[PDB]
Design an enzyme around this catalytic site. Structure first.
Site, short mmCIF file in Angstrom:
data_model
loop_
_atom_site.label_atom_id
_atom_site.label_comp_id
_atom_site.label_asym_id
_atom_site.label_seq_id
_atom_site.Cartn_x
_atom_site.Cartn_y
_atom_site.Cartn_z
CG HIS A 282 -0.49 0.50 2.48
ND1 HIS A 282 -0.27 -0.34 3.55
CD2 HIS A 282 -0.23 1.76 2.93
CE1 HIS A 282 0.10 0.38 4.60
NE2 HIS A 282 0.13 1.65 4.25
CB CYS A 283 1.28 3.99 -2.22
SG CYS A 283 0.09 3.55 -3.50
CG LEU A 284 -2.14 8.81 0.25
CD1 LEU A 284 -2.72 10.00 -0.52
CD2 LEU A 284 -3.20 8.22 1.16
N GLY A 285 -3.07 5.63 -2.24
CA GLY A 285 -4.21 4.99 -2.88
C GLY A 285 -3.65 3.62 -3.22
CB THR A 290 -0.11 -0.08 -4.59
OG1 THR A 290 0.02 0.59 -3.32
CG2 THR A 290 -0.60 -1.50 -4.35
#
EC number: 3.1.3.48
Length: 341
Positions: A282-285, A290
């Site tokens: 996971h990243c932000l979204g 990702t």
């Protein structure tokens, strides 16, 4: 037929909505409307209706033998019944809006709205009790590659679900891509750093100095505890990957791919629970970086893979935004080139 399954659902819901614990010591009607409706709306309902509420299932409301329990054991059920009913209000709108595509159910636990970051239904992760989480099982060429989701929402329930999933799905490793600056700009919880108690799950993560020396990665060892169960999952925190952009060099991506692959890599080929022992990324979204990271793991497993098929398969198993941004896709191509060379 839906004239009933709609009205008989637009009145039965507010009933459960307003319910106490002892006020449990409509339900037979509600399920009737649902069974009648029984496509993409039915699977949505099937998921919700399948959430366990008392070591059973909402589609059961052995429940009587269980109700007559403690005041506490019933409040935890009513609370669960409030959550489902709340979600069901969505079906009400989808019918009252009178359906080829439906994101899986989000019990308000998702960080971003599905209208922005949709969650493909058939690949949405679910816990042992059938509770759905804002995570998708990314799959390429019919095979599961990783559990991709948005940065966990900052709420005790969302984090508890995140951790429960980590322990139950026994993910090979956790891979966090958001930088220290991004985490400290959107206030993303550094849940993978210290000790926290999220509901029934406890987490203790200690940095691994030996492997966090490099100027690019911080690695931790995360010990999750829940009841009689324990599970340690390595964590890889990338600090030099700016959002919406590729890594500084193609070599750093390959390196990233290696360390992720060389941190657990357990899981048996062709296993029935193809859902377990996969890295959670996971990243932000759960779509840009990702998507790239996951793609990079595909090339390492097999540098021949068609990156266009990877992208298309990632989009069918999570959403249309996977691997958006040409910048990163170009680096993948470069990566594949070296792996082919």
């Amino acid at each position: 037929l839906l004239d009933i399954a709609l009205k008989g659902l637009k009145r039965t819901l507010p009933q459960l909505e307003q319910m106490d614990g002892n006020s449990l010591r409509p339900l037979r009607s509600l399920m009737t409307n649902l069974q009648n409706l029984n496509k993409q709306l039915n699977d949505y309902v099937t998921t919700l209706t399948n959430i366990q509420v008392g070591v059973a299932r909402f589609s059961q409301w052995e429940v009587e033998r269980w109700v007559d329990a403690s005041t506490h054991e019933l409040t935890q059920a009513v609370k669960k019944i409030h959550v489902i009913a709340k979600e069901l209000k969505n079906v009400t709108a989808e019918l009252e809006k009178i359906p080829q595509t439906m994101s899986g159910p989000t019990l308000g636990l998702a960080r971003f709205a599905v209208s922005s970051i949709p969650i493909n239904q058939q690949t949405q992760v679910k816990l042992s009790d059938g509770m759905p989480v804002p995570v998708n099982t990314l799959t390429f060429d019919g095979k599961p590659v990783a559990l991709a989701g948005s940065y966990p929402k900052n709420t005790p329930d969302a984090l508890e679900a995140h951790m429960k999933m980590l322990l139950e799905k026994e993910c090979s490793c956790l891979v966090v891509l958001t930088s220290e600056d991004q985490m400290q700009a959107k206030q993303l919880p550094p849940y993978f750093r210290g000790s926290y108690t999220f509901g029934e799950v406890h987490t203790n993560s200690q940095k691994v100095s030996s492997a966090s020396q490099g100027e690019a990665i911080d690695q931790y060892n995360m010990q999750l505890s829940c009841g009689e169960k324990r599970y340690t999952i390595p964590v890889l925190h990338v600090k030099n990957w700016p959002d919406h952009q590729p890594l500084p060099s193609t070599d750093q991506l390959e390196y990233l791919a290696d360390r992720v692959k060389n941190s657990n890599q357990n899981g048996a080929p062709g296993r029935s629970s193809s859902d377990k022992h996969l890295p959670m990324i996971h990243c932000l979204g759960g779509v840009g970086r990702t998507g790239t990271m996951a793609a990079a793991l595909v090339l390492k497993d097999n540098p021949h893979s068609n990156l266009e098929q990877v992208r298309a398969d990632f989009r069918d198993s999570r959403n249309n935004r996977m691997l958006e941004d040409a910048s990163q896709f170009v680096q993948l191509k470069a990566m594949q080139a070296q792996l082919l060379m």
